[PDB]
Assembly symmetry: C3
Homo-oligomer: 238 residues x 3
């Protein structure tokens, strides 16, 4: 559910769900996590680009209907572990990571992108965190955005549930660059080359130090998120 390509020392991972919006099914998560782990352990790889593919979305995220229909506390927990594991997978890559966002980055797709060292988007792309509008809890998205972009920006995004176009994303500093769709993947590879040229040792050590509090935050969020659901289903199942 991904393909792996190389621009010399740059590994390009293209998401290839049968659906062109790259919804994070279990299978797609696993393929991504596995590809990232291979990139990280492959010495020939010095930087990594993740891309939804041409005329596809970065990720429409997880199925909101599926999450609302989950019948057990444990179902939602295993799902929260999946979500947090996906993001930790990205944070634990000690080489430069670049997200090339086209189409939609929704929910998990938006959170996923925030794990990358740098983000570029197409001028025609959109970021969305619409969980609350759709009756989905947004505590994971909130914790992540509040860590990455601060409290007030997080509140605005999560409570307005708007589609954030390129100019809006520039304004929020959610992305580092905006380019045309047709130029995006190349622009991302280029930035990946630039960061791959940074001496690896100093980069690895720095990124580790940088990402450590983020990783810690996500682990706290893993634990904290399960808790309200344990109590909800304890009541119902009585």
């Amino acid at each position: 559910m991904v393909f792996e390509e190389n621009s010399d020392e740059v590994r390009v991972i293209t998401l290839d769900h049968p659906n062109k919006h790259n919804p994070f099914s279990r299978t797609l998560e696993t393929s991504v996590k596995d590809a990232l782990a291979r990139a990280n352990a492959d010495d020939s790889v010095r930087a990594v680009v993740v891309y939804g593919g041409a005329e596809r979305s970065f990720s429409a995220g997880g199925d909101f209907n599926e999450v609302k229909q989950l019948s057990r506390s444990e179902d939602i927990e295993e799902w929260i572990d999946r979500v947090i594991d996906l993001y930790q997978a990205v944070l634990n890559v000690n080489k430069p990571t670049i997200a090339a966002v086209d189409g939609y980055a929704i929910g998990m797709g938006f959170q996923f992108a925030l794990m990358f060292d740098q983000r570029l988007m197409a001028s025609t792309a959109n970021f969305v965190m619409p969980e609350l509008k759709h009756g989905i809890g947004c505590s994971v998205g909130a914790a992540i955005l509040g860590f990455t972009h601060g409290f007030s920006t997080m509140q605005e995004i999560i409570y307005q549930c708007q589609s954030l176009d390129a100019p809006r994303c520039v304004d929020y500093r959610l992305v580092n660059q905006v380019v045309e769709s047709s130029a995006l993947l190349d622009a991302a590879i280029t930035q990946a080359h630039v960061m791959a040229s940074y001496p690896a040792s100093a980069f690895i050590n720095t990124k580790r130090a940088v990402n450590k509090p983020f990783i810690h935050l996500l682990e706290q969020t893993r634990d904290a998120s399960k808790a309200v659901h344990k109590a909800a289903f304890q009541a119902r199942d009585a």
Copy 2:
């Protein structure tokens, strides 16, 4: 010192101090806290708007020679408790809260507005954190603004002590919308309806999780500020 009105499932609380600037006297704090607590417990209420009233200020904040003449250990701490209690009262509202800011939001008024889930202001409104300029400690305002808007933005605001007009507030991201005074309350009620339509359970849970570290910060601030004047 407040009036409570309803736009269906939206509770509108209008601050009604005798003074048109809605200074946070102990009476107005109590009325607000009491109204918020009613809104929070009332099942018919699915969102809350707080508004200073037409041709009034959101709040010019605390009485400021009161805090200079405030001089006894017990009295300054009583006052720090009041301030934090006021803000906690807003943070602990488990339904959407909207601040509709017209006129001035100064000091405690500014800090008070930062407790709301969303803020709209009038194009002719001003936010001010002038404490230091006036020889008033700003450690509580600093703590809050540092949490909500980050350290460097907080430094800028608390050390410059400027009147922040609508464009300046938009640039700082202190508010979510700017409208004309005459459209403000209606725009705030509209946003309260939008947020009220979010399924309550997911909203409540999310908000609790969102505001938890804010609440915790305020408690640390309560303890730190009182240990200063002690």
Copy 3:
């Protein structure tokens, strides 16, 4: 290695390394830390400006070649020097103003972030190029993440770009931009404004404000060392 002058209640500390770029040698660090401590203890001083000097840089930072070559007594000793320098600024309880002309690079950039306010010249540049040069940036990252949040920090340390005046305004790294010839006067002016704030409220507020920054730096000191080992 520094000059110390007065504009009434404003102490102006001008960095005067023999090199025009004011690199943080051990001697410059010590002169600056001593001048700051003097300024903080002198009752006649109500505000502090630090300036690289006319036609000079604020600071090109530390010698990256001297870092690349550091033993553990020395690596711990350098980290300590860096953090001690910044704590020295944070522990000044009077208003502190950085007047940045020329370059503020690496430690120079980090140093400037310790001040209550920053002004820069329209022709000045901030740079955090450590990673581009094979130098660890965990200290600069910790600091910038604290001051300007995570995503801005990431962008700055991973891009390693020269940040001109407009780019620093966009990042909110500085409070004002003025021409080089007007910079020091504008900085002294802001120092006068902040010096007029009643001292007791100011001191107590600033202490509460800077406390989590100081704590962060201390955690960073320890972490850079736990790591080196």
